[PDB]
Protein backbone atom coordinates (compact mmCIF):
# COMPACT_ATOMS: atom_id res chain seq x y z
CA UNK A 1 0.00 0.00 0.00
CA UNK A 2 1.22 3.53 -0.74
CA UNK A 3 2.23 5.98 1.95
CA UNK A 4 2.08 9.75 2.03
CA UNK A 5 4.63 11.67 -0.01
CA UNK A 6 8.04 12.30 1.54
CA UNK A 7 11.18 14.22 0.57
CA UNK A 8 12.98 12.57 -2.32
CA UNK A 9 9.87 11.02 -3.87
CA UNK A 10 9.85 11.37 -7.68
CA UNK A 11 6.69 12.46 -9.49
CA UNK A 12 5.19 14.04 -12.51
CA UNK A 13 3.59 17.24 -11.21
CA UNK A 14 0.65 18.91 -12.95
CA UNK A 15 0.10 22.68 -13.06
CA UNK A 16 -2.61 24.46 -15.01
CA UNK A 17 -1.54 25.11 -18.60
CA UNK A 18 1.52 22.86 -18.59
CA UNK A 19 2.10 19.16 -19.31
CA UNK A 20 2.71 16.70 -16.49
CA UNK A 21 6.26 17.61 -15.61
CA UNK A 22 9.16 15.58 -14.11
CA UNK A 23 9.63 16.70 -10.52
CA UNK A 24 10.58 15.65 -7.00
CA UNK A 25 9.32 16.31 -3.49
CA UNK A 26 11.97 18.59 -2.08
CA UNK A 27 13.43 18.75 1.37
CA UNK A 28 12.75 21.85 3.46
CA UNK A 29 16.11 23.20 4.57
CA UNK A 30 16.59 24.77 7.99
CA UNK A 31 15.51 28.40 7.81
CA UNK A 32 13.58 27.89 4.56
CA UNK A 33 9.95 28.91 3.93
CA UNK A 34 7.62 26.07 4.86
CA UNK A 35 4.74 25.04 2.56
CA UNK A 36 1.06 25.63 3.37
CA UNK A 37 -0.69 22.82 5.26
CA UNK A 38 -1.25 19.68 3.16
CA UNK A 39 1.03 20.99 0.38
CA UNK A 40 4.54 19.96 -0.59
CA UNK A 41 7.61 21.76 -1.97
CA UNK A 42 7.88 20.52 -5.56
CA UNK A 43 11.17 20.96 -7.39
CA UNK A 44 10.73 20.84 -11.18
CA UNK A 45 13.49 19.19 -13.16
CA UNK A 46 14.80 21.09 -16.18
CA UNK A 47 13.50 24.49 -15.13
CA UNK A 48 14.73 24.01 -11.54
CA UNK A 49 11.73 25.98 -10.26
CA UNK A 50 9.80 25.30 -7.05
CA UNK A 51 6.02 25.44 -6.45
CA UNK A 52 3.80 24.38 -3.55
CA UNK A 53 1.38 21.63 -4.67
CA UNK A 54 -1.02 19.19 -3.08
CA UNK A 55 -1.11 15.45 -3.82
CA UNK A 56 -4.01 15.90 -6.26
CA UNK A 57 -1.41 17.27 -8.69
CA UNK A 58 1.34 14.70 -7.97
CA UNK A 59 1.61 11.49 -10.04
CA UNK A 60 4.11 8.89 -8.74
CA UNK A 61 7.05 8.34 -11.08
CA UNK A 62 7.27 4.57 -11.38
CA UNK A 63 3.55 4.19 -12.12
CA UNK A 64 3.19 7.13 -14.52
CA UNK A 65 6.53 7.43 -16.34
CA UNK A 66 5.33 5.26 -19.24
CA UNK A 67 2.54 7.75 -19.99
CA UNK A 68 4.15 11.04 -19.04
CA UNK A 69 7.89 10.39 -19.44
CA UNK A 70 8.14 11.23 -23.15
CA UNK A 71 9.80 14.11 -25.02
CA UNK A 72 7.89 17.40 -25.04
CA UNK A 73 8.50 20.63 -26.92
CA UNK A 74 8.34 22.83 -23.81
CA UNK A 75 11.52 24.64 -22.77
CA UNK A 76 13.46 22.68 -20.18
CA UNK A 77 11.28 19.56 -20.35
CA UNK A 78 13.71 17.16 -22.01
CA UNK A 79 16.53 18.39 -19.79
CA UNK A 80 14.14 17.60 -16.96
CA UNK A 81 13.53 14.08 -18.28
CA UNK A 82 17.30 13.54 -18.25
CA UNK A 83 17.60 14.78 -14.67
CA UNK A 84 14.82 12.62 -13.28
CA UNK A 85 16.23 9.47 -14.91
CA UNK A 86 19.98 10.09 -14.33
CA UNK A 87 20.49 12.16 -11.12
CA UNK A 88 17.15 13.03 -9.55
CA UNK A 89 18.52 13.56 -6.02
CA UNK A 90 21.40 15.91 -6.79
CA UNK A 91 21.73 19.61 -6.01
CA UNK A 92 20.78 21.74 -9.03
From Swiss-Prot:
Cell compartments where the protein resides: Nucleus; Cytoplasm
Family membership noted in the UniProt record: Belongs to the HDGF family.
Tissue: Widely expressed. High expression is found in heart, skeletal muscle, ovary and testis. Overexpression is frequently observed in hepatocellular carcinoma samples.
Record function comment: Acts as an epigenetic regulator of myogenesis in cooperation with DPF3a (isoform 2 of DPF3/BAF45C). Associates with the BAF complex via its interaction with DPF3a and HDGFL2-DPF3a activate myogenic genes by increasing chromatin accessibility through recruitment of SMARCA4/BRG1/BAF190A (ATPase subunit of the BAF complex) to myogenic gene promoters. Promotes the repair of DNA double-strand breaks (DSBs) through the homologous recombination pathway by facilitating the recruitment of the DNA endonuclease RBBP8 to the DSBs.
Protein name: Hepatoma-derived growth factor-related protein 2
Result, substituting residue 21 to A: Loss of interaction with histone H3K36me2
Domain PWWP: 7-64
Known partners and oligomeric status: Interacts with HDGF. Interacts with trimethylated 'Lys-36' of histone H3 (H3K36me3). Interacts with trimethylated 'Lys-79' of histone H3 (H3K79me3), but has higher affinity for H3K36me3. Interacts with IWS1. Interacts with H2AX, POGZ, RBBP8 and CBX1. Interacts with histones H3K9me3, H3K27me3 and H3K36me2. Interacts with DPF3a (isoform 2 of DPF3/BAF45C). Interacts with SMARCA4/BRG1/BAF190A, SMARCC1/BAF155 and SMARCD1/BAF60A in a DPF3a-dependent manner.
Gene: HDGFL2
Amino acid sequence: MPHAFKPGDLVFAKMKGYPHWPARIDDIADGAVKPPPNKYPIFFFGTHETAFLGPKDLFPYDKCKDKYGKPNKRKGFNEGLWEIQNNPHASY
